[PDB]
Amino acid sequence: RNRLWLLTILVLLIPLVFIYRKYRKRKS
Amino acid sequence: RNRLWLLTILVLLIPLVFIYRKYRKRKS
């Protein structure tokens, strides 16, 4: 009811990174 | 009575962002 289930969960989070790319205004 | 299985299906979908990086089409 957890642990292994948690690993499956992490990927769902990854669409967040794409949103960050859009913000990419200036390099730092 | 449990959409937990459905959440697992979503995770497979995020590799799309990785594909965008390969394009390197600057802005878009």
Place this chain on the structure above:
Amino acid sequence: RNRLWLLTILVLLIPLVFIYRKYRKRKS
């Protein structure tokens, strides 16, 4: 035949794109 568990393993992989951002810029 039936490898539903295998499909979940693919899902773990997308966090890799986020990791590249952590590395920053190299080239050198």
